[PDB]
Design a protein around this nucleic acid. Structure first.
Ligand SMILES: Nc1ccn([C@H]2C[C@H](O)[C@@H](COP(=O)(O)CP(=O)(O)OP(=O)(O)O)O2)c(=O)n1
Ligand SMILES: [Cl-]
Ligand SMILES: [Cl-]
Ligand SMILES: [Mn+2]
Ligand SMILES: [Mn+2]
Ligand SMILES: [Mn+2]
Ligand code: NA
Ligand code: NA
Length: 326
DNA sequence: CCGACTCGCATCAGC
DNA sequence: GCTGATGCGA
DNA sequence: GTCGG
C-alpha cells in the first residue's frame, strides 16, 4: 500500500483511456505503470524516482509530481466532472457493456442504472444478466467462501465422471485472501490436443452444476469456455449469499501446464511473460509454447511437463503462483 | 524518431 | 448457412 | 504512454 494514491490514479487514468478514449495501448501503458509501482518497495517521493522503473515514462512522471505535490491530478478532476465521460465509465461497469455499447447507450440518453432498468429491452442476454447482478458483482469473495465453492465444484465434477480433474485458478491459486470471481480449469482424458473422444464434456459439467442450483445463469457458453453466475447455498433463515461470477475453461489434458499458467495469471503477469517470450523468440498461449522461426512464424510445440518448463525456455527463474500477482 | 504493444464466444456484415 | 470482423471478455 | 534499437 506504500504508493496507493499513485497506483489508484494510474488505474483511473487507465480506465479512462479504455472506457472513454478507446485507447487500449494507453490503457495497457497505465496498467503496466501501476503494476510496476505497486510492487516497488519504497514510498515514492518523486516522479524522477518513479521514472527509473520500466514502464513509467516522462508523462506519468510528471503526473506523479503533480499528485505528490497536491494530492490530486487536475486531468482526473475534470474527467470526473465531464458528464459523458462519467456516464460512459459507469455503464462499462455492467458485464457485457464495453466502451462501444456504453457510448451508444449514453448517445440514446441511457446513462444511469435506472435508465438501464427501464430499457432492459435494449440489452443483449449477457448485459441483461450483468445488470441483474450488478450489485452482487461489486462484492468481493472471501477466501473462506472460495473454499466452499471449490468443494462444491470439485465434488460435483467427480460425480459426473471421476476422470475429470478440476483446478481453481486465478487469484485463488495465487493465494489471495479474497477474489473477484471463481476461475475453474477443467480437464478430461477424452479431450487432448490429438482428439476429442467424448462430446459435451463441458456441457455435462455445466448441467450438473445447474441441477444442484450452484450455477444460476449463463453469460456465454461454447465447447471449451463457460462464463456465468453461481451462488453458494445458504442455511435455514440466513440471508442468501451474493451471486458470483464463474468462468470455466476446458483445456486439452496434455496441455494442462500451459493452461494452468495462463489461468493463474495475473493478467498483467501473463502480459509481461508473453511479451518477454517474444523478446526471447517464443510465443506462449494457454495451449503451447512455440519457437518463432527466422521469419516470425510459430514453429512446432516444444515439450512441456511442468509450469517451470515454460519459465525455463524464456530464461526466467520459476515464480510460485503467489508471486505472480502483478 | 517509430513500430510494436493471445484467444473464446456473441453478434453483425456480407455473401 | 458460412466466413471474417468487431466487441467483450478470460 | 513507453521504449528498444
Ligand atoms: N486480460 C486478461 C484477463 C485474464 N487473464 C487470465 C489471467 C487471470 O488471472 C485469469 C482470470 O481472469 P480474472 O478476470 O478472473 C482476474 P483474476 O486474476 O482471477 O483476479 P480476480 O479479480 O480476483 O478474479 O485469466 C489474462 O491472461 N488476460
Ligand atoms: Cl491506444
Ligand atoms: Cl497452439
Ligand atoms: Mn478470477
Ligand atoms: Mn474470471
Ligand atoms: Mn443476488
Ligand atoms: Na522508466
Ligand atoms: Na463491462
Amino acid at each position: 500500500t506504500l504508493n496507493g494514491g499513485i497506483t489508484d490514479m494510474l488505474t483511473e487514468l487507465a480506465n479512462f483511456e479504455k472506457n472513454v478514449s478507446q485507447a487500449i495501448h494507453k490503457y495497457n501503458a497505465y496498467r503496466k505503470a501501476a503494476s510496476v509501482i505497486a510492487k516497488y518497495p519504497h514510498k515514492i517521493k518523486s516522479g524522477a524516482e518513479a521514472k527509473k522503473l520500466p514502464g513509467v515514462g516522462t508523462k506519468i512522471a510528471e503526473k506523479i509530481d503533480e499528485f505528490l505535490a497536491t494530492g490530486k491530478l487536475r486531468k482526473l478532476e475534470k474527467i470526473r466532472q465531464d458528464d459523458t465521460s462519467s456516464s460512459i465509465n459507469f455503464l462499462t461497469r455492467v458485464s457485457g457493456i464495453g466502451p462501444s455499447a456504453a457510448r451508444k447507450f449514453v448517445d440514446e440518453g441511457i446513462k444511469t442504472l435506472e435508465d438501464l432498468r427501464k430499457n432492459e429491452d435494449k440489452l443483449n442476454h449477457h448485459q441483461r444478466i450483468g445488470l441483474k447482478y450488478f450489485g452482487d458483482f461489486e462484492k468481493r469473495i472471501p477466501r473462506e467462501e472460495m473454499l466452499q465453492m471449490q468443494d462444491i465444484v470439485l465434488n460435483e465434477v467427480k460425480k459426473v465422471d471421476s476422470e475429470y480433474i478440476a483446478t481453481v485458478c486465478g487469484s485463488f491459486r495465487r493465494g489471495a485472501e479474497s477474489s473477484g470471481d471463481m476461475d475453474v480449469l477443467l480437464t478430461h482424458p477424452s479431450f487432448t490436443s490429438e482428439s476429442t473422444k467424448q462430446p459435451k464434456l463441458l456441457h455435462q459439467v455445466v448441467e450438473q452444476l445447474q441441477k444442484v442450483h450452484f450455477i444460476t445463469d449463463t453469460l456465454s457458453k461454447g465447447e471449451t469456455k463457460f462464463m456465468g453466475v453461481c451462488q453458494l447455498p445458504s442455511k435455514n433463515d440466513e440471508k442468501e449469499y451474493p451471486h458470483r461470477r464463474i468462468d470455466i475453461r476446458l483445456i486439452p489434458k496434455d496441455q494442462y501446464y500451459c493452461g494452468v499458467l495462463y489461468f493463474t495469471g495475473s493478467d498483467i503477469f501473463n502480459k509481461n511473460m508473453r511479451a518477454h517470450a517474444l523478446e526471447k523468440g517464443f510465443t506462449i498461449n494457454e495451449y503451447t509454447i512455440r519457437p518463432l522461426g527466422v521469419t516470425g512464424v510459430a514453429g512446432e510445440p516444444l515439450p512441456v511437463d511442468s509450469e517451470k518448463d515454460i519459465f525455463d525456455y524464456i530464461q526466467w527463474k520459476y515464480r510460485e503462483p503467489k508471486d505472480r500477482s502483478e
